[PDB]
Design a protein around this ligand. Structure first.
Ligand SMILES: [Mg+2]
Length: 224
DNA sequence: CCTGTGACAAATTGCCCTCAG
DNA sequence: CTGAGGGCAATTTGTCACAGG
């Protein structure tokens, strides 16, 4: 119900351009949490196979495989920041490795650390047991945002633009068509989030003439 | 211009089993 | 017994032609 660790990131992260799998995204929640505790710092993070396979209910050998590819797939992966403004960064600067059996040692870009600490009263938070039955990476990105506007009693109301969701979430070009965007993004991520998470969701589109432009996300804690 | 759906390609899921220490 | 490995069938994604508006 609560035993999972609360994550806290700068808004800056939540609104950024990048592609990451379900699995890499799962790792990312874990790194920023070693990061979160330091005091002057550099970004060497540890990844213990045994704990990952407990935290996400996976088998020991299936867990490594997920860690193992996800890491190789960070080569040449970038993230792009904003405000206007525009800046393009590599996640890792040195491949991760294993000095012993069952360990992994990643080397985070230390120019990033500013954007996990950042600056108070302008950030996002959620307990981790919330996110961890999603499988679609994007349905994660939506949940991070919806949380950004969550007010203390657990509900909220927000209107995101369609041009925008595309470019921060870095969805596929095939989805600039709108009926596709119905079938494989929205009809799917509002579903999975609303059955795998303590939150009821609903939306209503906002046309402007012959086009649809904004989605009007509005939600309340499933506790009522 | 807008929409929804049928069908094909390509990528994901968890699952099953080998082998080295 | 743990994890660094190989493989799979079944399901979910990504693409796009077509029909009606
Ligand atoms: Mg897997």
């Amino acid at each position: 119900r609560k035993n999972s660790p609360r994550i806290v990131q700068s808004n800056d992260l939540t609104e950024a351009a990048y592609s990451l799998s379900r699995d890499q995204k799962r790792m990312l929640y874990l790194f920023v949490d070693q990061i979160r505790k330091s005091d002057e710092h550099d970004g060497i993070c540890e990844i213990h196979v045994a704990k990952y396979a407990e935290i996400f209910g996976l088998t020991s050998a299936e867990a490594s495989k997920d860690i193992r590819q996800a890491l190789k797939s960070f080569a040449g992966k970038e993230v792009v920041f904003y405000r206007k403004g525009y800046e393009s960064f590599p996640w890792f600067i040195k491949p991760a490795h294993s000095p012993s059996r069952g360990l992994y040692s990643v080397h985070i870009n230390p120019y990033l650390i500013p954007f996990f600490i950042g600056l108070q009263n302008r950030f996002t938070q959620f307990r981790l047991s919330e996110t961890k039955e999603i499988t679609n990476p994007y349905a994660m990105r939506l949940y991070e945002s919806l949380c950004q506007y969550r007010k203390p009693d657990g509900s909220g109301i927000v209107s995101l633009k369609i041009d925008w969701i595309i470019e921060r979430y870095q969805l596929p070009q095939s989805y600039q068509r709108m009926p596709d965007f119905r079938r494989r993004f929205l009809q799917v991520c509002v579903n999975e989030i609303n059955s795998r998470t303590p939150m009821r969701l609903s939306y209503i589109e906002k046309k402007k003439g012959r086009q649809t432009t904004h989605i009007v996300f509005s939600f309340r804690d499933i506790t009522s």
